[PDB]
């Protein structure tokens, strides 16, 4: 768990060197993008349940997975699916605020593949659900904030696949 | 079911089944024939139950079928009839099993979270199960209507 600042400090410390001009430039880049990160995080905190339910309405609804035999069939499985998608959106917001995806592979992508493979959860359908969540939130917060959200959404989909 | 519940309740207590629980399982085993008769009554006439209950529901709560209602546009009413069919199927499962752990353990745990994520009024769903209960207990004898209305009662109680 480290943001862009802590990773820059960790690189300069593992070097043992002081903060040179490249580290200063990286921190200036983060300190310019931080206000946009803050406003996108507020806008995403506004519409958590709406983004999640629009992602299910785009991908998972009216397909086979909500029908009998699907892994999203029962009300318990539906509630756990909404819970999993809320987790993905919340941690993508955290990784957007930090500017570093270390929290994603520390706390989402750690044992997620083995959990989903033990439960029988389809990984492709949940990857499509995360992609639709990314599409909806990029329609919500704009072009560049949607892109800096979608880089961590693509990180979650890549670590899941 | 009854046997699962008795086994688990003796299982946490690190004891065998008490004889009172054993005659409970025995009485449920004897009443299984009437349970199967109620299940055939509920299974064979599901078309009229779902149709008449949907009709009485949309008569009672017209706003969900009205513009701006969650169930709007033929498929929204029709889609709702599928959810009502799901709940009648779980009613049949709970009638056979002798307990509400099929109904609760399948379609009542996260029902509030699911129907809040869909944008559905849960009171109108409780009215749908109420009309299903009215049509179903209008279809049977007295003790059969009471035994089926117990599980219908549990579903409407677990809604609100």
């Amino acid at each position: 768990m480290q943001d862009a600042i802590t990773s820059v400090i960790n690189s300069a410390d593992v070097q043992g060197k002081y903060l040179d001009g490249s580290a200063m430039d990286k921190l200036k880049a983060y300190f310019t993008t931080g206000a946009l990160r803050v406003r996108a995080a507020s806008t995403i905190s506004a519409n958590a349940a709406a983004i999640v339910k629009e992602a299910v309405a785009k991908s998972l609804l009216y397909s086979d997975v909500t029908r009998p035999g699907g892994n999203m069939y029962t009300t318990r499985r539906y509630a756990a699916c909404i819970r999993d998608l809320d987790y993905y959106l919340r941690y993508a917001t955290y990784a957007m605020l930090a500017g570093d995806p270390s929290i994603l592979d520390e706390r989402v992508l750690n044992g997620l593949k083995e959990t989903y493979n033990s439960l029988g959860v389809p990984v492709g359908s949940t990857v499509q659900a995360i992609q639709a969540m990314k599409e909806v939130t990029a329609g919500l917060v704009g072009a560049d904030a949607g892109r800096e959200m979608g880089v961590y959404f693509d990180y979650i989909c890549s670590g899941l696949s | 079911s009854i046997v699962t519940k008795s086994i688990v309740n003796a299982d946490a207590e690190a004891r065998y089944l008490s004889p009172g629980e054993l005659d409970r399982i025995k009485a449920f085993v004897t009443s299984g024939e009437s349970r199967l008769r109620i299940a055939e009554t509920l299974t064979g006439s599901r078309e009229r139950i779902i149709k008449s209950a949907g009709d009485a529901l949309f008569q009672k709560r017209p706003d969900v079928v009205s513009p701006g209602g969650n169930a709007y546009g033929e498929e929204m009413t029709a889609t709702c009839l599928r959810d009502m069919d799901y709940y009648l199927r779980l009613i049949t499962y709970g009638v056979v099993a002798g307990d509400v752990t099929p109904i609760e353990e399948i379609g009542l745990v996260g029902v509030r979270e699911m129907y809040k994520s869909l944008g559905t009024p849960v009171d109108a769903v409780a009215q749908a199960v109420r009309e299903m209960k009215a049509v179903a207990t209008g279809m049977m004898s007295g003790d059969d209507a009471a035994e089926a209305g117990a599980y219908f009662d549990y579903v409407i109680g677990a809604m609100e």
């Binding site: - | 779902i50 949907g54 079928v65 033929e74 029709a78 009839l81 599928r82 799901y86």
Partner: peptide, 27 residues
């Protein structure tokens, strides 16, 4: 003919599209 896609079958159990006729029939 060897269709490369899923067969033309429809109205699987627990589908809302099967209950769309009965949705039309009710008020």
């Amino acid at each position: 003919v060897r269709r490369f896609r899923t067969p033309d079958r429809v109205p699987q159990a627990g589908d809302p599209a099967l209950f769309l006729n009965m949705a039309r029939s009710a008020q």
